[PDB]
Structure formats: structure tokens, C-alpha cells
């Protein structure tokens, strides 16, 4: 059926026309997605350890906490180094790709030791700053070896963007989520293809204006395309959106999905958390429905959720206003 069109890498194109508070603009993006699910219990678990202990470091007060945490990551690293990631199952253990994979953890352990030295000395601040640089390695290596890669570069084609890039992330292809083999009957998104689906949202920015978006996601030839119109009203000119007070980063979220039998579709809600420069957080409340375009039948799911992670970055050679996006996403909430 429609999931078959996602079994390999798929080229993507994104076009957005926006008007916020009268500020018109256009964003155009291209890239690819890779929705196939493959998983390793061992890596999953090593990666959980790594992930949790980084957060412990970020919030820690004293060196004792940071040392303890860094030591635990180091074990996970060396253990993760012996695994075979799902993306490289078919590769020889001594292949160039598997060597690079292992080399990724040689860098990572190197960086951890750097952070250990600073921690042992009592330099908690400096250690936390050295712990941050691990993220760069994670991002580089996730982009080569982690499953479900969605990758896209977006350019503001009308010049300077009058809203922060982070606020447009959600709007700018949930058909590229990884549904685990047992949850494949709950994947509305892929099921609707190639005729595709209409995706509508209202996004309420706490104590500021709202965005209201309408989009068509469908295959145009071999490309999965996402085309959106977006109106923003009621934004405050010294607010976080129009005042450009949002940090250039993105958090991880749960996206809650349920069937909407009335509309042969799905209703969807979540709350995006946008970090602000001063240290505060600004909530973006998402209300969403999806409706098929075609008359063909479509999988209506049970309650479940998508778990998301995103890295935002820049192309050092790009002079236009832009955003590079790396994103991994997995359906969850239903066992065997
Ligand atoms: C501090 C650094 C890192 C963190 C915080 C981190 C975190 C994570 C997280 C949270 C996941 C998702 C696990 C899940 O889906 O349950 C993951 C997956 C993965 N990571 Fe990392 N990671 C880091 C570094 C690396 C490095 C250096 C590599 C490669 C050398 C790597 C390779 C992978 C792979 C292949 C997956 C997919 C696991 C699977 O699907 O079985 N990671 N990581």
C-alpha cells in the first residue's frame, strides 16, 4: 500500500507562503527523509544512558554530580562502540562505514575525558561547557548512522525572515516518522499516500499571537511535497516572535495522535517549548487535524504518540537567511 513508497530514501520539497501581522514572506526547502524502522535494544539502551546523563550534567550544581555522570556516559560509549547499528547491519565489521562508526565513539570518549579533567579540578562551569560539545559529535554521527533521518535545508526566499526560524519548524512531513513493525497499522500518514493529506493547525503562542496554517502533503512524481499557507495575527511587536527573542535551538516533544472517524482522519495535539534568550521558555500550543485528499481507504489509528528530536544548524557558506534541520521521529505507545 502507501508505506511501500517509504521503504527507501525519499526526496522532499517544502514551499511556504506566510503573512504574520502583515509581514509577508516565503520559505522554500529541500532534502530527504528515510522512514524505515530498524532498532537495537542494546544501542537504544546505551543511547538512553548517554542521553539522560547529559541532562544530569546540564542541571548539576557540583563536580561530584558531573564526574559521576560523565563516568557513566564513558561506559555507555565504549559499550555502544561494540554494537552494530541497524543502518549498518549488512556491512562487514571491518568496513569503512563500521570503522567510522567506532571512530565516532573514539572522539566522544576523548571529549568526555576532557570534561572529566575539568570536573576533577572542581571547574564545574568549564566542565559543563566541554560537555556541551559532545552534542556536535552526536549530531554528526546521528546524521550518518541513526535511523529515521529527516534532513532539510530551508531558505527564506523573500529575504530576511520576520519570525524566528524555530517557530516555523513544526509547520515546515510526519509521514517520515518511524513506525515500529508492530505499530504499522497505526500509521495514518503513510497510508494516505500518494494522493496525500491536508494538514491544518492552529498554534497558540502563550501571551502572544497565533499562527493558523493549511498544508497539502503528497507525492509529486517521486518527490514528497509539503506546501503551506500560514496566517499570523495578534502578535506583539516587542514579543518573543517579532522581537526575535527565541534561541536558535529545538527541544524534544511528544505528539499525541488519535483517530477522527467523523473526518476519516486524525486529531493531533502537542505543546512545543521554545527556549528564550533570558533563560525562560515560551510555549506553543498546537491543535491539528489531518484529512485525506484521495477517496482511497486509510489507516485510522488507536491512541498513540510520536516522540521527536531536532537539531537546528547553519550552513557556513550560505549567505541568505536560512535553517538547516536534522530530525528523528518515532511512533510509540503500543506494545505487542
Ligand atoms: C552524547 C551523545 C549522544 C547522545 C546524547 C545520543 C542520544 C541518542 C538517543 C536519545 C537516541 C534514541 C534512542 C531510541 O530511539 O530509543 C539515539 C540513537 C542512536 N544513536 Fe546516539 N547519541 C549520542 C551519540 C552517538 C554517537 C557518537 C553515535 C555514533 C557513533 C550514535 C549513534 C546512534 C544510533 C545509531 C542511534 C540509533 C539507535 C537504534 O536505532 O538502535 N549516537 N542516540
Curated annotation (Swiss-Prot):
PTMs per UniProt: Contains a chromophore consisting of modified amino acid residues. Maturation of the chromophore requires nothing other than molecular oxygen.
GO biological process per UniProt: bioluminescence; generation of precursor metabolites and energy
Consequence of changing residue 272 to T: In P11; increases fluorescence at 475 nm excitation and at warmer temperatures such as 37 degrees Celsius. In Esmerald; leads to brighter fluorescence. In VisGreen; leads to brighter fluorescence
Protein name from the UniProt record: Green fluorescent protein
Outcome, altering residue 281 to A: In mut2.1; shifts fluorescence lifetime from 3.03 to 2.50 ns
Gene: GFP
Pfam families, per the entry: GFP
Organism: Aequorea victoria
Effect of residue 311 to V: In EBFP1.2; shifts the excitation and emission spectra to shorter wavelengths and increases quantum yields compared to BFP
SUPFAM superfamilies on file: GFP-like
Amino acid at each position: 500500500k502507501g508505506e511501500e513508497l517509504f521503504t527507501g530514501v525519499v526526496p522532499i520539497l517544502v514551499e511556504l507562503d506566510g503573512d504574520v501581522n502583515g509581514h509577508k514572506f516565503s520559505v522554500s526547502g529541500e532534502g530527504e527523509g528515510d522512514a524505515t524502522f530498524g532498532g537495537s535494544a542494546d544501542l537504544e539502551d546505551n543511547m538512553e544512558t548517554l542521553n539522560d546523563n547529559l541532562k544530569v550534567i546540564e542541571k548539576a550544581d557540583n563536580a561530584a554530580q558531573v564526574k559521576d555522570a560523565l563516568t557513566k556516559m564513558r561506559a555507555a560509549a565504549l559499550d555502544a562502540q561494540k554494537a552494530t547499528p541497524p543502518k549498518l547491519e549488512d556491512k562487514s565489521p571491518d568496513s569503512p562505514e563500521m570503522k567510522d562508526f567506532r571512530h565516532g565513539f573514539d572522539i566522544l570518549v576523548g571529549q568526555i575525558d576532557d570534561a572529566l579533567k575539568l570536573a576533577n579540578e572542581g571547574k564545574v562551569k568549564e566542565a559543563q561547557a566541554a560537555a556541551e560539545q559532545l552534542k556536535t559529535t552526536r549530531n554528526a554521527y546521528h546524521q550518518k548512522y541513526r535511523g529515521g533521518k529527516l534532513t532539510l535545508k530551508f531558505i527564506c526566499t523573500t529575504g530576511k525572515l520576520p519570525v524566528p526560524w524555530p517557530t516555523l519548524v513544526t509547520t515546515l512531513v510526519q509521514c517520515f516518522s518511524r513506525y515500529p513493525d508492530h505499530m504499522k497499522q497505526h500509521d495514518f500518514f503513510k497510508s494516505a499516500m500518494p494522493e496525500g493529506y491536508v494538514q491544518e493547525r492552529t498554534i497558540f503562542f502563550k501571551d502572544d499571537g497565533n499562527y493558523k496554517t493549511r498544508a497539502e502533503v503528497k507525492f509529486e512524481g517521486d518527490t514528497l511535497v509539503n506546501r503551506i499557507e500560514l496566517k499570523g495575527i495578534d502578535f506583539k511587536e516587542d514579543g518573543n516572535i517579532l522581537g526575535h527573542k527565541l534561541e536558535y535551538n529545538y527541544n524534544s516533544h511528544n505528539v499525541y495522535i488519535m483517530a477522527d472517524k467523523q473526518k476519516n482522519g486524525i486529531k493531533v495535539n502537542f505543546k512545543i517549548r521554545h527556549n528564550i534568550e533570558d533563560g525562560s521558555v515560551q510555549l506553543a500550543d498546537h491543535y491539528q487535524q489531518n484529512t485525506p485528499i484521495g477517496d482511497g481507504p486509510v489507516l485510522l489509528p488507536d491512541n498513540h504518540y510520536l516522540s521527536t528530536q531536532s537539531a537546528l544548524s547553519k550552513d557556513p557558506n550560505e549567505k541568505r537567511d536560512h535553517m538547516v534541520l536534522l530530525e528523528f521521529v518515532t511512533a510509540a505507545g503500543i506494545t505487542l
